[PDB]
Design a protein around this ligand. Structure first.
Ligand code: GTX
Ligand code: GTX
Lengths: 221, 221
């Protein structure tokens, strides 16, 4: 009997794209925050984590690990995964490009300090020259307010989340991509997303060094 | 209309799981091998690669990039992705664990020499203590010949592929996992997989140093 229950630490990390997708879908959720290695070990010892890792989400009577398993379930359940197999292929292709870029941004702070400047420069180059051109071209191709099927899907949600992180890195990177700018505004004004973006929501801030320190202690790295 | 066409270099890399899945499904396909940077640049210049990367597969009148988009499409098309949303969530959880382990093995040879021994040691620990226990537990929980739904799915195929790679790493690692051993035998005896395992199929050999140098020249890393 439950709202979905999100098991993670109090940070974006690997859970934030799930927070975004549930919120976009209008689904209220609860979070159980891991604060210590001891908390993680309890989840493990109680049999809740198939591969001894989080994210884990309790939803519809079961316990799901692996970010993509969680996301795929939520997207299908709430009709955000397209209408057929071909639309799912477009969605998947798009969101896996988003994932590749998002992964780079997620792990930047765990890069060795002597590698960070080059890694950041590489991310900016890929945004400007690979990823933003590819999504701009999709929107330019059909002229529709959404990426796939002329209707909101998880692709729109995952992309606009990523546009917010790119803005935190360098607000100028989107400047030559007017359709991406317009998508960002449109998605951000949908009632459910607007509510998620407002202060006090479950949306999480950029990870600071204190949070990274907590991650290292919880996940033992 | 036409057979799927697989665009990659002549190696396992990120295309081999697609070769296994198609073969297991009984689907004949064609390969177009990239042999140099110039071949890759032609695919790029011709507009065929959304993110300027391969794998790319031409299937059912469309070009798909991103390994998971390709695999998801093929699995759905050939009824290897479960029967409903809950079975897909089990499949996705399982295969993303498999992916995590597979990725560690795939990238081992591009780890700096100074760190390879320690990375290999940690991969073997995770196999023995994390991943093989998790899959053995699944098979023991229901006593069924397949991981999900008592019928062949992509999870069985992706797992057994990985079991072949683990065998190449260290043939002792599976020894305390009799149900995984049994699964490897049963799946290997399915007519389509048996054929794929025999000589002269599209199955690719382990990547040797000369093939890794070719990857470096093609992909410019
Ligand atoms: C820079 C931010 C990093 C913050 C921590 C990373 S997420 C926590 C980590 N989980 C994973 O790595 C899960 C990977 C998995 N592929 C998924 O996406 O769910 C964990 O439980 N690690 C414990 C373990 O593997 O033992
Ligand atoms: C031991 C080395 C392993 C060799 C595997 C390299 S795969 C080739 C590489 N493609 C990718 O990285 C694709 C990643 C994508 N997430 C997917 O899974 O399809 C590429 O085109 N790279 C060119 C580029 O990104 O510019």
């Amino acid at each position: 009997a439950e709202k979905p229950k999100l098991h993670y630490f109090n940070a974006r990390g690997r859970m934030e794209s799930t927070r975004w997708l549930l919120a976009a879908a209008g689904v209220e959720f609860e979070e159980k925050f891991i604060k210590s290695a001891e908390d993680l070990d309890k989840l493990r010892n109680d049999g809740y984590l198939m591969f001894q890792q989080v994210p884990m989400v309790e939803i519809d009577g079961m316990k799901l690990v692996q970010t993509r398993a969680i996301l795929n379930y939520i997207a299908s359940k709430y009709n955000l995964y397209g209408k057929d197999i071909k639309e799912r292929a477009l969605i998947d292709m798009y969101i896996e490009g988003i994932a590749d870029l998002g992964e780079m941004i997620l792990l930047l702070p765990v890069c060795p300090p002597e590698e960070k400047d080059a890694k950041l420069a590489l991310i900016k180059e890929k945004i400007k020259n690979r990823y933003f051109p590819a999504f701009e071209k999709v929107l330019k191709s059909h002229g529709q307010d959404y990426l796939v099927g002329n209707k909101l899907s998880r692709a729109d949600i995952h992309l606009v989340e990523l546009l917010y992180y790119v803005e935190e890195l360098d607000s100028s990177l989107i400047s030559s991509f007017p359709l991406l700018k317009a998508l960002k505004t449109r998605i951000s004004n949908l009632p459910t997303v607007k509510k998620f973006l407002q202060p006090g929501s479950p949306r999480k801030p950029p990870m600071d060094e204190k949070s990274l320190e907590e991650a290292r202690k919880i996940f033992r790295f």
